[PDB]
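Help! Submission page says 'invalid entity' but I think these are all valid:
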Amino acid sequence: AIPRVAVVVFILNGNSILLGRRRSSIGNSTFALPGGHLEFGESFEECAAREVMEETGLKIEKMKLLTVTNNVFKEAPTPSHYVSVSIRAVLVDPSQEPKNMEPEKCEGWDWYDWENLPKPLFWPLEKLFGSGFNPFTH
Amino acid sequence: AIPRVAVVVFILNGNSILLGRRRSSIGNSTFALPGGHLEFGESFEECAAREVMEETGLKIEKMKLLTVTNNVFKEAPTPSHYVSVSIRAVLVDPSQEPKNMEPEKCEGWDWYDWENLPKPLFWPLEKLFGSGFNPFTH
Ligand SMILES: Nc1nc2c([nH]c(=O)n2[C@H]2C[C@H](O)[C@@H](COP(=O)(O)OP(=O)(O)OP(=O)(O)O)O2)c(=O)[nH]1
Ligand SMILES: Nc1nc2c([nH]c(=O)n2[C@H]2C[C@H](O)[C@@H](COP(=O)(O)OP(=O)(O)OP(=O)(O)O)O2)c(=O)[nH]1
Ligand SMILES: [Mg+2]
Ligand SMILES: [Mg+2]
Ligand SMILES: [Mg+2]
Ligand SMILES: [Mg+2]
């Protein structure tokens, strides 16, 4: 039980962000960002681009740190504390279609408009958005 | 070997911040902020107050997130990668003096004016400042 670092990516395309339904013990079936565990020696930007590539195939650019959130899943059956570093990015090719590279972990990735976000959102994302956080302007 | 989360605290007192020379494997003899490892189940604000109390005896309040930095210590004798969450705080009692609670880990804590910081600064702290980061106005 130690806090673990994740990097999560807001890929902005027009007024939309990329989200996908998790297949996981935590946040199962909820809509979440691409992202994953930060590796030893890795920068935030390296992690963001690598995770997006592994999960979606998408090539990203203009990465920028947004914020960091503390996410303790106190009532999970196994200890889960994540510190999630949010990165903004855009596509090198805004017409590039997302692929579902890891179907065991995600139902598929799709674009959602900022004014018509899907439900249910993964709790850390719900919590961050409930605070007023806006990845387009932060 | 994994990235580990630390919380570091900019205690603002007038135009000064608290710094102390480290006694450590990492950043030995360099001036650094109070702070340390985030514990499982702890918030960033709770960690800031706890670490400051442990290291300095100071009572702080109005803890606010500033930023996060990614610091891989290639010079360390063991794999050392810290994701360092910066918190701003102030003293509950502006007359309270710091105390060197852990003299085996620090040479002592003092206040330094923003325009006349001491040298050598611990390099992650120096890098943050070199970017234009100002904890008073951020
Ligand atoms: N993927 C994703 N993870 C998030 C979000 N918000 C958030 O706190 N996290 C935290 C909780 C996740 O369990 C944690 C690690 O990400 P993950 O569950 O996608 O793990 P992963 O398999 O991609 O990690 P890896 O094996 O690729 O290193 O990051 C989000 O919106 N998306
Ligand atoms: N104290 C402190 N640590 C910093 C700074 N910048 C930075 O990257 N770190 C990283 C490097 C340290 O090896 C790492 C852990 O902090 P630390 O050495 O003070 O750890 P600690 O013993 O106080 O942790 P704990 O046992 O009290 O919980 O945090 C800073 O300005 N101050
Ligand atoms: Mg992944
Ligand atoms: Mg993932
Ligand atoms: Mg400590
Ligand atoms: Mg410390």
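Support: the input was valid. A stray whitespace character was the problem, and the output above is from the cleaned input. Chain A has one domain: 1-138.
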